[PDB]
């Protein structure tokens, strides 16, 4: 129960009245576990290194008392484990009775050891100590792989979710390695990394709920970046003409399994570039980045959780492309002319969202209504591959230039993976005449683009939601050290 | 005036309704300028590689006087140049006539052209164009070389900052590149980058006042970051040994030369790593980085501004240690008995202050009276070099460790470079017992009991470091500002 706690911080007591630092400041280390690993794993069974002395430490992670000269336990550090064995002939006696200086360690206690290294006559590779020193003290009971199966104590105290699952590790490893490669990816063709603020006094980018803020000093109300979109196109204006940024969003809506108020987000603006380019690049990437971490371009995927069958997804370029107002046309056999914002057509969308009785979108403006058209008859067409909804309309891209020879639609793109958006790009409207909500956006924008702004293709990425699709999560909150949860 | 910008809106218009695209969907460049002039710099003057087409595009930043049959010009674009030099005889006449072509060419306009390269018998290497096309105009008139001075102006539209004056490319390049180099050194030495959670309940990890907003539908205050301390600190108990984040923290407090209310910080913590760790990690890092920057250890700054003569920084290691209470008792004379929110220790704490003119904080609480006193008598003891102020009184440092053989310090470290704090580190309080705020003075204080909970479980013994990202960039970049090296720095309007 708690008592296991409570008779913890009275043995923390004990020591301290006793004399001894159950906290010490300092223990140097010669090697680590891994180090340790690579090192002795091919020595022979039974033999000892006695004569080389080592200082390791790690994680108590299991303990048995076979007899009472031979102890054993599980010693883990940095994902990887170890035995120690910790035998009487072995022990100096001068710096404490053997019993009861190995009694005392409980699962989870952090400890530094001086032995040398050896294998068991069964061929576990060991640390067999001479001294062992508690250095910080696991005062509750650590609990075993039941009970970190699926409750929020995994997003609440990630730390026992990172001790106990392996897989999670692995999983925050990934993560990191996915930005790593992206990072280099952008760096290696010349794209150079800024920092855009976070508080501004308008939000623009995109379009949802914003977080609103106070300065004191400033007297002001700030909103948190919905977006990096406009002021890394200023730098564009500004000459930097291949720039990009990888950060936290703030987008304050609703919490489901592939949205969280604050997310991972990368957006990336190359000058002379149009969305023709934008395809090449997404495909480039996105195969070569699953090939860097899987030596191959196919993944499993468990869409539906680990208790139903997963299904594989190739991410062999080229991916399809799909343009949206079309395919809907195609699937519902309707003719949605323009203008979009019709009432005669905005009547058609309406009634086919009432045949199928699909969601009524909140304000059932054509723009929205196109989404959920989209939503529902294209977005989770294709589930063995990625591929692209390319070809919006204007009134859903108030930012993406005017299509060259489709009027009404835009350069547009998005990438989707199992029917979830991972992915937004487009050919950048640059013509300061055409943006039409200049006379929310910025005036500070607007007037840049008056400077000139070059052609440009601009693409983001939704670097959470990647990342679960190549750790094989199914939430968002997997995929995030500590997500935000209500208390 | 407006009257300049109406005039390009209008030859805009013109141009749409003539037919010409003055924004073309795409032009395919075949090479860079910096390219461009890396591949052809070492001609002959007066060469011509007439066979040789390329497509390359820029920013017209100079319009010499039309000669009638040659058009000059100044092409630049990733902060170089290249001359522009159109010839009657090499124009391509199928598309349109010579004149009218250039003539609308104005200072500011982005180009795309097609030419051949070239040298002019004057030693300038420029491009030859046979074709050039409107890629974006600029309709407005550009600042001159040194007429962008007002910086209300380079920090309200810093891409005009970016455009007009050359060093301003390069402070932001060298800040990329220390973060870059910063990056670098913690993944050599098997550290690992994580991001943490910028909203929370509250904001721990430093005494400052904080950014607080509201998630609309889970109906929930929450409070932005002050600082990455207390969640690295918990995957150190989940076992990431060495971890760090690089990004944005915010602090509610008031903007100067060196306080911005959101700025870039970066936080490790290493286990099994203790104070001496933490101290030679400063010194290797400081030095190899201004090392990497300069190819030298020593740099130049102008502490007291630009028009004032500048000071020499070096950066050689070893960097002295002042402990911060030894030298005010050196310094003032006295002798600060322990403990320190003794009421004779805070009464002749006091008597100091104000036999030497000193503001009095606005809560005279103990660790404030500490907190003054070092600024006045220690923080600009040394300006030719970093130093660190150490071994703090616990009571300035809730999350420090206690010192091992000082009673009533902490193994607590602090880098000034010219009197500005950049560097902020020390061995971690691990004991879940010693921290008092899990079981506190009633604005700027303290705890989270998550936090505290993890403690429980095991924190190791640990040393963390902070390093105030841009403060360190405004002393590589010659800056007296924090606000000449963020972007976009926040104003008001
Ligand atoms: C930057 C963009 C480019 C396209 C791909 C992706 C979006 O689909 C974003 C939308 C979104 C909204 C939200 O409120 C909370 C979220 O976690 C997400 C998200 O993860 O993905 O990132
Ligand atoms: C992470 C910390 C530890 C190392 C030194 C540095 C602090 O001195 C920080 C204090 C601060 C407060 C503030 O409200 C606004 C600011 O721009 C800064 C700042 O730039 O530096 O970074
Ligand atoms: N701001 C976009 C990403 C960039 C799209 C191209 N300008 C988004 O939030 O989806
Ligand atoms: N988080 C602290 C720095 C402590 C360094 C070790 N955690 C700060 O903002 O000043």
Redesign the interface.
Known sequence: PRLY?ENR?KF??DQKDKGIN??????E?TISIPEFIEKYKDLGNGEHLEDTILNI?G?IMRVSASGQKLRFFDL????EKIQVLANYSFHNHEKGNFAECYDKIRR???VGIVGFPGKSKKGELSIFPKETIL??????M?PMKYGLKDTEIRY????????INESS?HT??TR?KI??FLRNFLNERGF????????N?IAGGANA?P????????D?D?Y?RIATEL?LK??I?????KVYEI??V?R????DNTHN??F?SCEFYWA???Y?DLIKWSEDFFSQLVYHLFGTYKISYNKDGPENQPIEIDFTPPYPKVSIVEEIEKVTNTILEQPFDSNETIEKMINIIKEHKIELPNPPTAAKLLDQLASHFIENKYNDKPFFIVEHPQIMSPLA?YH?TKPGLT?RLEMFICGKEVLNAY?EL????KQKECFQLDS?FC??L??????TGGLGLGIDRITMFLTNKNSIKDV???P?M??
């Open positions: 706690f911080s923390i007591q159950p906290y010490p400041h300092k223990f280390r430490t994680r883990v550090g940095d994902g989870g206690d952090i250095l910080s003290a696991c005062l509750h650590l609440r105290q990630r730390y026992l979710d990172l001790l590790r925050f490893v990191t930005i790593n150079f990394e800024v920092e855009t603020p976070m508080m006094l709920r977080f609103i803020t106070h300065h004191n000093d400033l002001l700030l948190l002021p200023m730098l204006v500004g000459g930097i003409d950060g936290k703030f304050n809506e609703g919490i108020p604050e991972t002379y570039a149009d023709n230039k060259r350069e050919t640059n013509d300061p005449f500070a007037t840049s008056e400077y000139g702004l070059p052609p995030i050290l500590f935000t209500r208390p």
